[model samples]
Target: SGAIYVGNYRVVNRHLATHNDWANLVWEDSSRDLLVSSTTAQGCDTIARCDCQTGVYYCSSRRKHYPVSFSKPSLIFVEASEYYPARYQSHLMLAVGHSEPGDCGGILRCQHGVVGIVSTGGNGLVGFADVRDLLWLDE
Candidate 1:
């Protein structure tokens, strides 16, 4: 009997900038790489799950896997919650924390389109600047 697997990460896509705002903004493309596969732990009746499956990366065009943050000076937050539905899931969804000082980096502006940033950095789905408007709150 043997079964044990946890978390680890690495995904690189460092090719930044290429503006968009036809419907809801876009950007994040360059050289890329992806790695993170060693997940399978499911035992439920209460709560227990670990199924990385290359975590999350769906760039844009709606379908879930949004929220991208990087403030090189210490601050990284990414997102992907299996398209939500665990009481509006997002259990810190996929993490890299700390960054609350003007939210790091520079030149970011937002309005009714909500917030946006990626600037540059790799694997999780290229560079980013997709102002996630929530598509009518996913109605």
Candidate 2:
């Protein structure tokens, strides 16, 4: 399964992980205001997860929500709200976090517009690149 759900909208059937390459999806439906609500500020202090759902398809347990602290220029750093994870220890899949495994290729977004795609992560930080900046990557 390859997709990320934006409310009722489901952006699906694409793979950045598989051999096909070009991690993107284009669907029949599209939205207008998703852009109107976005901004060009790349140095934004906050961002959100663009995964298939609140939690990965495997775990029945719930994931916790954490605050996003921008680590500057296309990186999201997260920290626990409490000492955290007291509710569920089985991989507390979160939209934001400091130390937890996540599915990459999901589009990270801002309220203003779609910004980055999840690329790599380690040491409580995730790496990404702006979609607008990534287009026209030449041969």
Candidate 3:
């Protein structure tokens, strides 16, 4: 059987920007060579390919990794980091998807201290942008 492990995700935190906005985390549709996320909190920079193909979905603020998409869990994790924080830190959290099997993809945007989770619904999702745009949602 597989076992679960926990760890403190590492990433360099930047001083942040006045804009306090996050760019859309996008995977290279053509190249698929990289995934990217940018945010004002970390100098409006991008952490490339932070998610890769496995793990708890994160990136490194220094080296950086491109986001990779293949399945639903992968896609959702992409959305969760938005408005939250890239696993690698640089404040970027991109996503990826594989055409083989039940793969869906989309971008997760975190901005103004808020997270907007998006996805290319289909397969089983039939997706759309959803969030509790109210204070109570915090509950």
Candidate 4:
């Protein structure tokens, strides 16, 4: 099993020797209360699948490749602990134009949409899985 992340929460979807992947998290009153916010997240679409970069697109089955071009707003880094602006890269790495530590589990939103969550950072960028496919990104 591996650790998937989303907004101050290190979520574990599950593991199946790595075929297609997803996340699963149970929320209690304590955590649920803290999660109170506005804006129901729309799945990242072709229009909202970009930020801090040009010519952004995502389509992969770990075998095939098809990318679309879109001009969404810059990727926003939201945090319950701390927030920062970041550049979203393919392979799902988020960066603040520099390297940082202890920022794992932060949320990556593209124009108020889901892009996955931070799992690892260092070596100049924060890493996360590209779960857009599971959410039908650009589909």
Candidate 5:
């Protein structure tokens, strides 16, 4: 019941989640095929790379890629959907600028636009180390 590393990104497993934490359906660009390794504006790792022209998106998961069939027709408000060059911008801002194991004293958790860092060892969260550990972060 924890998040796993997909290359350098930490992606929470949908099956293990009690509820969906990520609900935003953002739009991507139509210029060209997006590279999976691309990061957001804040230098955070991206969750997916979408081909706006074809609506075929390559989602990053566990260091591999999967295709999601969400066509352009499914996009209701083109303006409403947060587009790339800006995608995952909020996540990057929430993530602390530290990557070392001992550098951070707690885990970063966010919900409903609220982001917090909770202690993993002192607040009876020792048992939840799997989900509390910070593995990778934005540079």
Candidate 6:
């Protein structure tokens, strides 16, 4: 049992956290969906994006040091609820940048590829290698 983050904000916004962890936040902007992950905010904090329109949000969080074990075979998806952006495909991988000294090692994409890198606990992770490794990322 370990911790991990999905998306982070400190990379783009505030810098607050015991270890710059990634906090996933999802809010609907009038049908315009947006996802946010950060460290400077709390799990229940209302993160104000580009507007004052505060919508009820769903969130997920992950710590960098905690270990992670995949339960699914491939195409891993994280969801807080049926209404959030939980259905993420393999194209998304742990943000290697988040693996930094103060980051949660969140998820990211390399340019425009489909499958991205997943974590193997700690900052020490293994890329999908090929399409076969993805079998461990799904649910």
Query: Best candidate, TM-score-wise?
Result: 2
lDDT of 5: 0.22
Tens-place lDDT per residue, model 5, 1-139, is 2232333333332222222233321212132101112223332323222222211111122222222221121211111122224222111111112222221223232221112111111211111112211223322
* Runs with alpha carbons beyond 4 Å of true place in candidate 5: 1-15, 18-43, 47-51, 55-70, 73-139
Q: Model 2: how far is 52 from its true place, Å?
A: 23
Candidate rank order under lDDT: 4, 2, 6, 1, 3, 5
Q: Which ranges of candidate 6 are over 4 A from the true structure?
A: 1-101, 105-107, 113-123, 126-139
For residues 1-139, what per-residue lDDT tens digits would candidate 6 score against the true structure?
1122222232221122233233344221211112223444433212211211111111123333233332222344443333344444342222222232223223322222212223321344331211222222221
lDDT, candidate 1, 29-72, per-residue tens: 22111111222343221112222212223323332343333321
Error of 4 at 9 (Å): 13
For candidate 3, lDDT tens digit of each residue in 1-139?
A: 0001112111111112122212333211111112223323323222222222222212222122223333322223222222334222212223342221122122232223212122232243322122213222222
How well does candidate 1 score on lDDT at residue 93? 22
What is the C-alpha RMSD, rounded to one decimal, of candidate 3? 16.8
- TM-score, cand. 3 vs. native: 0.19
Residue pairs with backbone atoms closer than 3 Å in model 1 (clashes): 11-123, 12-122, 12-123, 13-122, 13-123, 28-127
Model 1 score (lDDT): 0.24
Quote each prediction's TM-score: 0.17, 0.34, 0.19, 0.32, 0.16, 0.19
Clashes of 2: 3
Q: For residues 1-139, could you state the per-residue lDDT of candidate 2 as single tens digits?
A: 1233333233321222232222232322111101111112233222343322222121111233233433334223333323222121111122333322343444444554444444334465543333333222110
Candidate 3 yields a Cα-based lDDT of: 0.23
How many steric overlaps are in each model, in order?
A: 6, 3, 15, 2, 1, 13
In TM-score terms, candidate 4 sits at 0.32
Q: What TM-score, to 2 decimals, does candidate 2 have? A: 0.34
- Cα shift from native, residue 115, model 2 (Å): 1.2
lDDT of 4 by residue, 1-139 (tens): 2233333333332212122222223321221111111123442223224343322212121222222222232333333323323433334444432223333333344543545434434554434434444332232
